[PDB]
Design a protein around this ligand. Structure first.
Ligand SMILES: *[C@@H]1O[C@H](CO)[C@@H](O[C@@H]2O[C@H](CO)[C@@H](O)[C@H](O)[C@H]2NC(C)=O)[C@H](O)[C@H]1NC(C)=O
Ligand code: NAG
Ligand code: NAG
Ligand code: NAG
Ligand code: NAG
Ligand code: NAG
Lengths: 131, 491, 98, 372
């Protein structure tokens, strides 16, 4: 279009971003999700829904977006290795995307390397045991 | 209408060179020297419009007595006759408004346009802050308005725009409000005499900030102020006059050629109160006229009626005139350049009495309140905080503040190497927008936004109506609104 | 809930601890305030209780003036303190254990 | 109007200590050779020390020459449109004006528009002087409060203009142009099917095809004043200013009057504090240094089907007095269904919306009653 159309990378976290194959004969899912491609470097077009996708849709409606989900493959979330960054945060650090919706806990190193937005749900290390 | 009677000598040759290149009629150009009687020029222009049937007038005059005197009466006469007049050697911003001068077209950019040049220079070295010092005159106000809107376009409120009273001695008090700031980038825009006076005042007061970044206008770097000029950075080619006169003559000739539709000039200067109906169309076509063959570069104009894309020449290396910078219309160890702003180390912090977070306790007779030990046998850090008494006047008495946020502030100070001086809020309310009599902030937000504050270390919530004007750090405690009630007594 | 707001205009305590002290007697039945304060008051008074579930769950925050160079470093230091366990120790020292 | 100024009723109305010459200009020469008239009036003021000035010529561009004359010398007051146009002027001239500023007209119009129909919407204005200031004041005065906004309607002036004019849909419209330029716009609107009872046009510019019945304008309170009455009022104002400056300062100086002199000092430009407090004919004149009067008396008038202006409303002391009722509308005809109801406490609750302000919280709808 060039300012707009931010490419959005995400990941499959079952509480938040659920990915399902949208091939019930028709080439789409129910009118509650958003089409999601993948990466390889005609792939089957999955589609994502849940919590974070709802936030993405509402934000697109409000501020004005033209997004395209970019389900990531090279690692999960992110962890610096051997002086290089992989995963979702690693991809955002390099010139490959401009937003990384999904489950992405905000830490010190990531915030130093990649500027974050305002948190919208609490999180942290918590422990669960059988009972 | 002629300077030194020398331009008029070549005016006939310039007209003849452009008259045929033809037909239609042949306009005769007449020039009259400027007079202080304020009466002779009226008779001269009446004779010119009666016999020669002049379709336009030209303005060009040396400094002489005050510059914004000479072109005003001829512009007024033109407005009475609704006849366009081309001005030269005058760049006063007061002529930029057509409300007073309906028929006045200026081919030289005014001082207000220099705000765009200053913006470009600011973009050159990427300065994120700026200080404005403009004279309290029409030109200064116009320049300040232009710079303010241009900067607010990029979503950044100007830091400390100030006003300086023109024609006043001992303006050092203004420097009193211009010394404890946080930016070294300052822009000065005033009259040449005013600039010289303020420069001399800085000279005797010897806090000139020499060797630091200054941005001034062409008038401020004039020769009269150059005698006492401190370290400077704006030169314009026009300051030739003959080239501009020839360009205007060519523009008039092109307009006349394209005019060929009553175009009946007033034969009688007096005795008729009617105006020229063709005059508004004449002014419109000059405003929409394009003259790419101008000697002094491109001769494009703007909506206001002033020429654009002029010649801009940029350091004051001992009265030097080196145009190091590169800018022509659209060409978008310390310079007498360093970072524009220097961070302060005397942050003033605002805190509000909240029971679990910021305990406030009265001090002792000596001056410092009694030291206390925690249950774990460790000292409890407390800071002397100056705050209002009672809630009934408003008397400030130093108490001591401690608790959670004070501990966090101390840790921040240790980890950041910056001193602090805590200072409670006056009203006592956290902060909200309130209508006055337009809406204004009141509370802690009032102290932080414009008052005497730099940070607000207090249990301040985060919401949309607050983050618009205040930047919020990442949260340091999570919570939510909840309701407290009295438990029922229990046999 | 705009009409609700009207009912809060007749009574609006111009303080924070004053309203709690008033609630200590039967003069103001229900108070509405940030949880991190009411919880401590309930723990340290043994007479008032918090009812309902949290709503408008937006945390505290150090403020700073718009376009200020302190934002990045203050946020970084706050996050490092959160991860370092300093904030937990501070909360234990100054809020809990009453 | 030689007979009206011959007896000089202002002399009987106001009596002072100095000479107080009856004739303000003593020469009705506002015609051929204005320069000769300027010269003779300057000579008369220099010689006889006159104490009056009148500019009666409804030619609309005559303001700048009067400003230059004031700068060269004595205050100049126009009575009648020399004073009908308000513009920023040089501080060296002691110009006196009787008209209403564009900002005051805007504030009056937007105060009366809060009763009948609160939708400014169309704000069509041509490429005319002061249009930027008018648009800026439109933007400022609509911040907060309750006035809605629909469009801006920038255009320059038939069919091509008619299409742009009809592009924006509204009921109340504001026009800003010259008096000569007004007629083409009205012709285009009539050709565009807009000059009807379903639309109202607010002629707000400094002025003063058939005009539509919905033409509302605002002018000064002296619009209906007689020429003798206006001359007397101006003479009273200048006399009050002269007496105030002679009494407060305790001196009897000369008000310049060195017309066409040589090497005149420019140190003294003008004074305006002496005219801050004026009271005459049960009217308060503030006379701000720019030239207009702070909080003046204004009249909102309308154009009837008989092409005759009538006084519709009065604006004074930040107060609006009207005559017509308020109800809802002039009639848009399919829409606007009148809805009858009743007060059933579970369902339809009625409360008096008078907490100082004339409305309730932003959760209800205004409700009238009936009486017949
Ligand atoms: C934010 O903090 C960082 C680290 O404490 C600062 O980074 C250094 O700051 C010093 C002094 O300002 C510079 O001389 C160094 O070049 C910076 N970088 C490094 C790697 O040391 C940074 O300046 C701080 N920013 C602000 C606005 O205070
Ligand atoms: C042109 O104007 C000048 C003005 O001084 C006059 O002397 C000259 O006679 C005029 N010539 C013609 C041909 O009109
Ligand atoms: C000039 O202004 C400064 C700052 O207010 C003041 O200290 C000084 O006394 C003034 N000097 C004169 C001569 O007014
Ligand atoms: C700007 O460009 C024009 C057109 O080539 C030229 O006439 C003029 O001298 C240039 N000015 C500067 C300062 O480079
Ligand atoms: C401030 O208030 C304290 C309360 O104990 C009181 O002791 C002190 O005298 C007050 N000081 C002033 C100046 O009012
Ligand atoms: C702390 O700041 C002061 C003043 O800016 C400076 O003199 C000192 O060297 C700094 N120390 C450190 C460790 O940054």
């Amino acid at each position: 279009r060039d300012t707009q159309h931010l490419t959005v990378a995400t990941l499959e976290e079952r509480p938040f971003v659920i990915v399902e194959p949208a091939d019930p004969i028709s080439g789409t899912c129910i009118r509650d999700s958003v089409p999601c491609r993948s990466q390889l470097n005609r792939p089957e077009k999955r589609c994502c829904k849940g919590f974070c996708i709802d936030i993405l849709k509402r934000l697109a409606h409000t501020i004005g977006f033209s997004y395209d989900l970019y389900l990531v493959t090279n690692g999960k979330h992110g962890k610096k290795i051997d002086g290089v960054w992989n995963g979702m945060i690693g991809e955002v650090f390099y010139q490959r995307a401009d937003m990384a919706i999904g489950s992405l806990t905000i830490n010190e190193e990531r915030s130093e390397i990649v500027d974050f937005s305002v948190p919208f749900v609490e999180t942290g290390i918590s422990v669960m045991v059988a009972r | 209408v002629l300077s030194t009677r020398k331009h008029e000598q070549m005016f006939r040759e310039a007209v003849n060179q452009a008259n045929k290149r033809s037909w239609k009629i042949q306009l005769n150009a007449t020039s009259v020297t400027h007079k202080p009687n304020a009466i002779q020029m009226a008779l001269s222009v009446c004779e010119d419009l009666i016999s020669s049937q002049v379709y336009a007038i030209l303005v060009s005059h040396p400094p002489t007595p005050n510059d914004h005197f000479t072109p005003t009466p001829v512009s007024y006469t033109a407005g009475f006759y609704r006849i366009p007049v081309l001005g030269l050697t005058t760049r006063m911003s007061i002529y930029s408004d057509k409300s007073i001068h309906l028929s006045f077209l200026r081919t030289v950019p005014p001082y207000s346009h220099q705000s765009s040049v200053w913006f470009e220079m600011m973009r050159v070295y990427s300065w994120n802050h700026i200080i404005l010092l403009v004279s309290d005159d029409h030109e200064g106000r116009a320049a300040q308005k232009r710079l303010e809107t241009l900067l607010e376009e990029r979503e950044s409120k100007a830091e400390k725009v100030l006003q300086f009273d023109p024609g006043t001695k001992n303006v050092t008090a203004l420097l009193m409000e211009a010394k404890e700031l946080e930016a070294r980038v300052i822009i000065l825009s005033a009259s040449e005499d005013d600039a010289a006076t303020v420069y001399r005042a800085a000279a005797m007061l010897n806090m000139t900030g020499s060797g630091y970044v200054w941005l001034v206008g062409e008038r401020e770097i004039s020769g009269n102020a150059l005698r006492y000029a401190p370290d400077g950075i704006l030169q314009l080619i026009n300051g030739n006059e003959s080239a501009h006169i020839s360009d205007a003559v060519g523009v008039v000739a092109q307009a006349v050629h394209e005019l060929l539709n009553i175009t009946d000039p007033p034969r009688g200067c007096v005795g008729n109160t009617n105006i020229w109906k063709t005059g508004p169309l004449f002014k419109r076509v000059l405003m929409s006229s394009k003259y790419a063959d101008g000697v002094t570069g491109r001769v494009e104009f703007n909506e206001d009626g002033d020429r654009k894309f002029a010649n801009y020449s940029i350091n004051l290396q001992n009265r030097k005139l080196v145009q190091v910078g590169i800018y022509n219309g659209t060409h978008v160890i310390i310079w007498p350049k360093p970072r524009g702003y220097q961070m302060s180390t005397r942050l003033k912090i605002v805190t509000i009495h909240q029971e679990p977070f910021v305990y406030v306790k009265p001090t002792l007779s000596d001056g410092t309140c009694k030291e206390e030990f925690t249950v774990n046998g460790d000292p409890v850090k407390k800071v002397i905080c100056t705050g209002p008494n009672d809630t009934s006047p408003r008397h400030t008495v130093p108490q001591c503040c401690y608790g959670f946020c004070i501990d966090l502030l101390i840790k921040l100070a240790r980890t950041m190497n910056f001193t602090y001086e805590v200072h409670l809020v006056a009203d006592g309310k956290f902060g909200t927008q309130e209508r006055v009599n337009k809406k204004e902030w009141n509370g802690m937000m009032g102290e932080l936004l414009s008052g005497q504050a730099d940070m607000i270390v207090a249990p301040l919530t985060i919401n949309n109506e607050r983050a618009q004007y205040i930047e919020f750090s990442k949260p340091f405690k999570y919570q939510g609104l909840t309701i407290l009630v009295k438990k029922e007594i229990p046999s | 809930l705009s009409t609700m707001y009207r009912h809060m205009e007749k009574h609006n305590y111009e303080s924070a601890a004053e309203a709690i002290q008033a609630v200590r007697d039967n003069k103001l039945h229900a108070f509405i305030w940030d949880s991190a304060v009411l919880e401590f008051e309930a723990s340290q008074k043994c007479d008032l209780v918090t009812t309902g579930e949290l709503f408008f769950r937006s945390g505290f925050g150090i403020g700073m003036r718009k376009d200020s160079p302190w934002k990045q470093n203050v946020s970084l230091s706050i996050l490092k303190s959160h991860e370092n366990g300093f904030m937990e120790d501070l909360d234990k020292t100054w809020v809990r254990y009453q | 109007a030689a007979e009206a100024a011959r007896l000089g009723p202002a002399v009987a109305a106001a009596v002072r200590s100095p000479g107080l010459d009856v004739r303000p200009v003593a020469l009705v020469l506002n015609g051929s050779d204005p320069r000769s008239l300027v010269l003779q009036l300057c000579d008369l003021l220099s010689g006889l020390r006159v104490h009056g000035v009148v500019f009666e010529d409804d030619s609309r561009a005559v303001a700048p020459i009067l400003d230059f004359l004031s700068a060269q010398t004595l205050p100049i007051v126009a009575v009648h449109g020399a004073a009908l146009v308000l513009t920023p002027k040089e501080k060296g001239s002691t110009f006196l004006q009787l008209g209403s500023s564009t900002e005051q007209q805007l504030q009056v119009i937007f105060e009366v528009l809060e009763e009948y129909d609160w939708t400014s919407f169309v704000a069509v204005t041509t490429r005319a002087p002061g249009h930027r200031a008018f648009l800026s004041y439109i933007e400022v005065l609509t911040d907060g409060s309750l006035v809605g906004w629909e469009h801006r309607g920038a255009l320059t002036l038939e069919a091509v203009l008619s299409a742009q004019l009809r592009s924006v849909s509204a009921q109340i419209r504001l026009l800003f142009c010259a008096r000569e330029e007004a007629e083409p716009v009205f012709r285009a609107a009539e050709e565009a099917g807009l000059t009807g009872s379903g639309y109202v046009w607010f002629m707000v510019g400094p002025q003063l095809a058939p005009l539509p019945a919905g033409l509302f304008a605002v002018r000064s309170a002296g619009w209906r004043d007689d020429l003798a009455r206006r001359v007397a009022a101006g003479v009273a104002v200048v006399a009050r200013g002269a007496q105030a400056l002679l009494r407060d300062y305790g001196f009897l100086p000369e008000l310049g009057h060195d017309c066409r002199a040589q090497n005149r000092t420019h140190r003294g430009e003008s004074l305006h504090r002496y005219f801050m407090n004026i009271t005459w004919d049960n009217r308060d004149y503030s006379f701000n240094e720019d030239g207009f009067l702070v909080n003046p008396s204004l009249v909102v008038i309308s154009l009837t089907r008989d092409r005759t202006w009538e006084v519709v409303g009065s604006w004074e002391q930040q107060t609006l007095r009207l005559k017509y009722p308020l109800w809802s509308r002039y009639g848009r005809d399919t829409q606007h269904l009148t809805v009858a109801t009743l007060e059933e406490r579970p369902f339809v609750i009625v409360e008096p919306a008078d907490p100082i302000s004339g409305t309730c919280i932003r959760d209800s709808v205004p409700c009238r009653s009936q009486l017949n």
